[PDB]
From a paper:
In large-subunit catalases the gate and small cavity are formed by Arg134, Glu484 (CATPO numbering) and a loop of four residues (Gln185, Ala186, Ala187 and Thr188 in CATPO). The highly conserved four-residue loop located directly above the hydrophobic lower part of the main channel in large-subunit catalases is thought to act as a gate allowing access of H2O2 to the lower part of the main channel, while reducing water access.
The E484A and T188F variants were selected because they have a lower catalase k cat but a higher phenol oxidase activity than CATPO. The E484A and T188F variants showed a decrease in turnover by 53% and 48%, respectively. However, the turnover numbers increased for the E484A (sixfold), E484I (fourfold), T188D (threefold), T188F (fourfold) and T188I (fourfold) variants, while they did not change significantly for the E484D and T188A variants. The presence of heme d in the T188A variant and of heme b in the E484A and T188F variants was also confirmed by crystallographic analysis. Although the K m value did not change compared with the wild-type CATPO enzyme, this mutation had a negative effect on the catalytic activity. In the T188F mutant the solvent distribution in the upper part of the main channel is very different as the phenylalanine protrudes into the channel, while the lower part of the channel is similar to that of wild-type CATPO. The channel appears to be closed in the E484A and T188F variants, which would prevent H2O2 molecules from entering the cavity. This is due to a shift in the position of Thr188 (in the E484A variant) into the channel and the corresponding Phe188 residue in the T188F variant protruding deeply into the channel.
Residue numbers in the entry:
A (entry chain B), C (entry chain C): 21 to 698
B (entry chain D): 21 to 472
The structure:
């Protein structure tokens, strides 16, 4: 590890300059005690120059994100399908670093914005660094990389005033979507719960593009990468996500960090779909088109190995901010395809690192270094950290005995382009007509959602599109939505007071696919790390005792428990003033606290009606909620919460309450609380 | 627009490269209709290279902010207290640009966080650009610029995990405040409604530091700048600010934008407290200490002129993101004081623009340019736009007839340091004992608030 | 070995990317064998991106230079005059790196231009890096750092056409000198032999400024740094320097490299003049004025230790090009003075490294690292290598238990400003009248040169000034020269078509000072590394035999021998076609080769007259020359060289030839061959 060698320990010692001279740094050098500061104060200038130059350009996209270290372990020797060394043996472990992100917001923007999300994984393999630079949605908005600035300019804030930070809440974004129909598949995903995942740990990762697996014999197959969450899939509800974006802008980065610090590091099965070269157009669409998925019914997933994140960074800036991913970081055994979105990406990520790093030696940053020797004739450049011994860095040479040697298919384990690949035809700036069906798969995705999930998507569209000022853009939007689903266009049109255009059934169908729905993916497989808010009072010794009782039990089941009361003390984590339902996955009121709720209700220590509002919000947003200890009635009545409601608990027995409530936490959302269009 | 000369119109025309060759930009050049992309596709590369390099480093502090253009109008001829040209005639008008901001959060952090706020004003005067780089709170946390990184590291997110955004909600910030008691006065202000103003239009601007006004005869007085809102002061309530941060992270920038578009451009009376040099220690504290206000009961405000913001930018990046303020942008008639916070600032803002701009010619960006001619011997550097005719850029010269000439108090309307300033004593890294009362003024402030 | 941890070996292995993936780099990936190159060719792009970004800005001055590693060893414990740790014990060793340079030319300009030269030394001390950033001339052109760009613009090429390279050969430089008379002292130095040293090893190093030595008790003394060459002082003659600029632009860098490779690493005694603070104005000038020396007659040198350079770099770019010196790299025991030239330097060198390195972490380059631990709260910035474990990098803190601790005079061996220093008075942009005598010291320096040396300086002035177009500028130059010396003005004026102004005796005097003359500094103390060219012929096996004999005699004494003949073979190093007298410190003809020695001598293998012209040029340029074997007349008469001349040798006996000739090498130059004005 190059990271270990560069760890700097400041737990002891006297302050020094960056050249080891002991110094101070608290008072400027001045000509007399009330005098002007001196130019000769080097202590001052070196410290302030450093401060003045701390910042580097944020990423052009995916600026907001967070990372962690961990380990990938192969489940088998996969030699039969790829020459990739990291996959060549059962149990082979390779270090990883992952960064997760949103796409459109700047650094500092909230984690819980509605957006596409990044899931970028570096495997520090024994034959070079291999990056899979993925998203949590398996399809992308556009079909050619040259369009990327168009898409991004359209979704980022309007450039006269840099308003708004909400990617989908403005005219220009919808102008682009409605004029560029390829966008429809990703737009439907982004309008689903996949736009507001519950956490990084509760989403999947996709390579998006078709890639190749290449064997040592030169043969190739076509693959899609799928990183399948072992935590289960889960989303926020929209109103919850909007509150969260104010109450805790760092919600996802904090959820990740805390899960790793508690020993609950997240896991994914790294999987592929594998198909033959001859099936490039067999599935009703072109595998070069990054706006299409291969339905799992046509190509099942094969599990290749386990990805686990189990260590946090030491210095966020040095590790997370400076990690520089590239789809060009490929290894023997993997190759590209002619997907025009992937093709252009290869150029963009090598170039943009010059912008961020300010010089060409970015791969020498510890987080970017490989874990094998580097042998090449790259030299000089700003920020050169190596002292190269070889004074004849050219090929061919005799003066260094012909080293470094060329690597290729038959030497040195070289990378090699899949040798079956060809190209033929004119040199064209033309779109393949095989790419032209922009609507069937959006409809496939929509069909595969549950009824209340369909409602949530329609409601997201109603919310966002109602913020578009231009009537002409809104009509254009309905034109495209209607090519996917007339019912979607009708329902969305109703909220914005326009008429939907008449049904156009060209692309309509009733087909469905497995594995895309959040609401239909079933209870979570684990409730470890999920958050329980226990609403108590310092008024009643019995209330605090009840909360402590609940705590001990819930904690041994891996839940993160917060006891809330008017003021802090022994056993109480959070005041009502700072508490919010967005902080919890379930809320329990201890019945000793009934007085705070069954009330209007007033104190200089928190806002009027806060305790009840926490419970009310939690219910409205679908969470398991309950009252533990004796007389539920009054709290549930004060909240207008029905005691017979699914995911509403009322028990005197602490043990029965915990059992029932824990089943609620796995269910995670009670969707019968949300109204549906008739 | 005052930057009309630099505008580029794209309401008509065919797409071109940056060198005027008509091109397309929607499909990559490929070897066959389902083929790989070609390296010879210059259309693709020049567009993507530009996109790849769009971003520049955010400001080290005050990263989150918004700006507008306007006009300053002097109420009087202020010659009898300052030689400043922009203040030398009743009704004299000078263009301005102002940027408002928070302090701690990054780009895209919400407007309605609890924080200190910036209020930075550029006057494009007929004798040079003059910047007053102020905040909405009249006192600062610390008493020496060398401590700035300490303060800022402590309020910014913890550096292992970059949590939390939200300057005051974590241990390190309160560790620093409690170890560095100078911070109490600004801390009390930030914990008041001044930490969550209703808009940029409903807050005041303060230079914080004592500065000097200098007359053409060389006499000086000590001043504090106060920009007093004509919209009134108003705050959010905290609960509301928290919900707004989520519902509308752009709330202050939109409020300002909208007010200008509707013809309600915000206004401030630009004022000063003026006191004699003999009064530097007369008010029971030291006027060099930036943690203290001069109570208005001791020195009333004089209104100098009107600041009105009435024109939004054309391109946010080019104007607002790229504007580069400096307290060293000073003009004849103003001078510095030995406030050790101010003193170090003068170094920081000139250096940090190298970081943002990536080269030394940042004064050439349209928003940074002055509105009068430039005559000097600065040359070259990355990004040099100017084509200088003078092929002898050194002084003293005879081969360019001794031009440019030196400007000073007696010739050429030069800047000059206030000639009554002196220094005396040991060269010390010592804090004046006159700085040591960290608590009385925070109590003055608290006492001055209503009960609620 | 001092930077061994950063070394990269490429003597074995297969080529890899920068992230360790084995690759090739000799053929682009193409769509067919005669097809266009593919964007997906990451091998191509990463290699070419690196190439495209290899260059960094050259230094703003001193762009042309060369460097080496070495060791400093202290002669004593100097705690009686300084707290500095590297000087605190007899025998104490500290690693060093030195870079030597010219000043005006760009990084590809010739070594042997007439110029001021740099001598910058880094001591990697056990209390931090300490740099002495000196020159080979003890005084500077200007008295205030603010004037630096005026000076440098005036000497660098005219900015319309970037002509001429060659600092003194144009109007603007002499315009500046004549308008800014402070320049006279350094000008007279640069017009002497000190402007064209024979090698970096044959020049001294000076700090120029008065600095302070500060004891641990707080008391201070004023010092000047003098690095006195143990190789002796030596110059080129001007015509020779001009020829060398064309025949070997790398002459000084090669001389240094070679001396080190041969185990003849150059040495200096590091010395100071030490005077009391009360003697700031006692010597008839102000010690804050960098245009003045303290004559050695008023303040003798104290030898502090030995500097020896003995290891060449491994990678020039990484070590020599990237070394970033600063006078701000100061250590406890040393302080600044209020010299206004020094004061502003402190700002310049910290700022300019942002330009060169392109980011703030330049102290992390291996050559710039200290050799002790770094403990501070500087963070982030582009190119940040360090992974800092202290997540509370602010002072004051409790969450990192108050570390790093402040260092100062009384704790932690902090740097401290000399506590006796004060300032008093108005804040002014005024020059001290104590700086106003710009002419007395130039006259002192001129008076201390020998007659022939004064002639050489006049002749350099005549050469350069005659290239100034402007008759006004020429007139103004003679006004200033005449204030130093009427006779200089007269003699210069005679070459350039003008009358000198009448004598103005205000600053005239006859005082002299020791240690500044080159011609007067006596024979060299060592002749090891000096170059002897033996001119032979392949047309007589006897001539080669003589050459071989002489070679062994000369090599025994550490001279570097080149045997020249018409064509190469074993024992012959160089052809006449490539050889030139600039290549040698002495020239010997073996008498077996006498037939070659005619201006008549014609051949397709070398220019007509070449063998003889080497001998004639050597003679004209002052060098020891002779004929070995017993028959000298034919060669000597062809050369018009008299047999009884001083530094002309003729002997049959090889031993007796060599004994005589080695005395001539030590004398080095026979100045009786140069005409004097009468
Ligand atoms: C399938 C389509 C894509 C996926 C899945 C994807 C994914 C991502 C991810 C996850 C990141 C963030 C990596 C990190 O965490 O540091 C990112 C950054 C970026 N992407 Fe993409 N991307 C796609 C398409 C594009 C295209 C078409 C372009 C350009 C033509 C592009 C240009 C960029 C740039 C310039 C960055 C910033 C990289 C950096 O500064 O390190 N991407 N992408
Ligand atoms: C009286 C105390 C201070 C006030 C009122 C103040 C005000 C501000 C304001 C308003 C801005 C943003 C300007 C804009 O909108 O672009 C800012 C930026 C900045 N300030 Fe200060 N500041 C203070 C003290 C300090 C100190 C002590 C330092 C450093 C020693 C410092 C360094 C900076 C830097 C580096 C920036 C970013 C500038 C840029 O990138 O253009 N400030 N300051
Ligand atoms: C006593 C007067 C001076 C001496 C002896 C001197 C010496 C030198 C030396 C030897 C170097 C080259 C160091 C190396 O080899 O890398 C150099 C570089 C330089 N000097 Fe000076 N210098 C003097 C005055 C000035 C002044 C007054 C300034 C500016 C105000 C200045 C600015 C620079 C700059 C900008 C560089 C390039 C540094 C780099 O890129 O690392 N120097 N100086
Ligand atoms: Ca818009
Ligand atoms: Ca959902
Ligand atoms: Ca290949
Ligand atoms: Ca903290
Ligand atoms: Ca308020
Ligand atoms: Ca010239
Ligand atoms: Ca000489
Ligand atoms: Ca740069």
């Amino acid at each position: 590890s190059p990271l270990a060698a560069y760890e700097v320990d400041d737990s002891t010692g006297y302050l020094t300059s960056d050249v080891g001279g002991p110094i101070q740094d608290q008072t400027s050098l001045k000509a007399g005690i009330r005098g002007p500061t001196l130019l000769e104060d080097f202590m001052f200038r070196q410290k302030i120059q450093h401060f003045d130059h701390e910042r580097v350009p944020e990423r052009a996209v995916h600026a907001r994100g967070a990372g962690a270290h961990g380990t990938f372990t192969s489940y088998a020797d996969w030699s039969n399908i790829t020459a990739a060394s990291f996959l060549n043996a059962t149990g082979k472990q390779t270090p990883v670093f992952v960064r997760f992100s949103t796409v459109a917001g700047s650094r500092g923007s909230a984690d819980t914005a509605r957006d596409v999300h990044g899931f970028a994984t570096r495997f520090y393999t024994d034959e070079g660094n291999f990056d899979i630079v993925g998203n949590n949605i398996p399809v992308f908005f556009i079909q050619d990389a040259i369009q990327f600035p168009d898409l991004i300019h359209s979704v980022k804030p309007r450039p006269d005033n840099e308003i708004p930070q909400a990617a989908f809440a403005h005219d220009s974004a919808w102008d682009f979507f409605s004029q560029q129909p390829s966008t429809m598949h990703t737009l439907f995903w982004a309008m689903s719960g996949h736009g507001i995942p519950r956490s990084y740990r509760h989403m999947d990762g996709f390579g998006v593009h078709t890639f190749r697996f290449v064997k040592d014999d030169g043969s190739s197959k076509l693959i899609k990468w799928h990183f399948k969450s072992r935590q289960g899939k889960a989303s926020l509800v929209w109103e919850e996500a909007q509150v969260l974006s104010g109450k805790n802008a760092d919600f996802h980065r904090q959820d990740l960090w805390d899960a790793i610090e508690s020993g609950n590091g997240p896991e994914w099965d790294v999987c592929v779909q594998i198909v033959d070269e001859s099936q490039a157009q067999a599935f009703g669409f072109d595998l070069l088109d990054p706006t299409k998925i291969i339905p799992e019914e046509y190509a099942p997933l094969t599990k290749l190995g386990l990805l686990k994140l189990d260590r946090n960074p030491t210095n966020y800036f040095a590790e997370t901010e400076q990690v520089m991913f590239q789809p060009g970081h490929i290894v023997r055994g993997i190759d590209f395809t002619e997907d025009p979105l992937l093709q252009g990406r290869l150029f963009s990520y090598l170039d943009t690192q010059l912008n961020r790093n300010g010089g060409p030696n970015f791969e020498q940053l510890p987080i970017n270094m490989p874990r094998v020797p580097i042998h090449n004739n790259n030299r000089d450049g700003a920020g050169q950290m190596f002292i190269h011994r070889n004074k004849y860095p050219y090929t061919p040479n005799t003066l260094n005995s012909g080293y470094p040697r060329q690597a290729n298919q038959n030497a040195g384990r070289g990378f090699f382009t899949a040798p079956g690949r060809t190209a033929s035809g004119a040199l064209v700036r033309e779109v393949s007509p095989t790419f032209n069906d922009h609507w069937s798969q959006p409809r496939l995705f929509f069909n595969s959602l549950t009824p209340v999930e369909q409602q949530f998507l329609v409601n997201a569209m109603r919310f966002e599109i109602s913020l578009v000022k231009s009537e002409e853009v809104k009509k254009n939007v309905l034109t495209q939505l209607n090519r996917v689903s007339h019912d979607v266009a009708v329902r969305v049109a109703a909220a914005i007071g326009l008429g939907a255009p008449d049904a156009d059934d060209t692309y309509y169908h009733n087909n469905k696919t497995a594995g895309v729905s959040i609401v239909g993916s079933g209870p979570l497989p684990t409730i470890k790390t999920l958050r329980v808010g226990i609403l108590a009072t310092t008024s009643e010794s019995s209330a605090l005792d009840q909360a402590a009782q609940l705590r001990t039990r819930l904690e041994k089941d891996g839940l993160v428990v917060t006891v809330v009361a008017e003021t802090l003390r022994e056993g109480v984590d959070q005041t009502y003033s700072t508490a919010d339902a967005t902080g919890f996955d379930g809320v329990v009121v201890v019945d000793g606290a009934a007085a705070l709720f069954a009330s209007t209700a007033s104190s200089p220590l928190f806002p009027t009606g806060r305790p009840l509002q926490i419970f009310v919000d939690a219910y409205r947003w679908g969470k398991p909620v309950g009252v533990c200890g004796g007389k539920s009635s009054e709290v549930l009545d004060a909240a207008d919460v029905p005691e017979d409601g699914d995911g509403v608990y009322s028990e005197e027995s602490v043990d029965m309450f915990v059992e029932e409530f824990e089943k609620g936490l796995a269910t995670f959302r009670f969707t019968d609380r949300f109204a549906l269009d008739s």
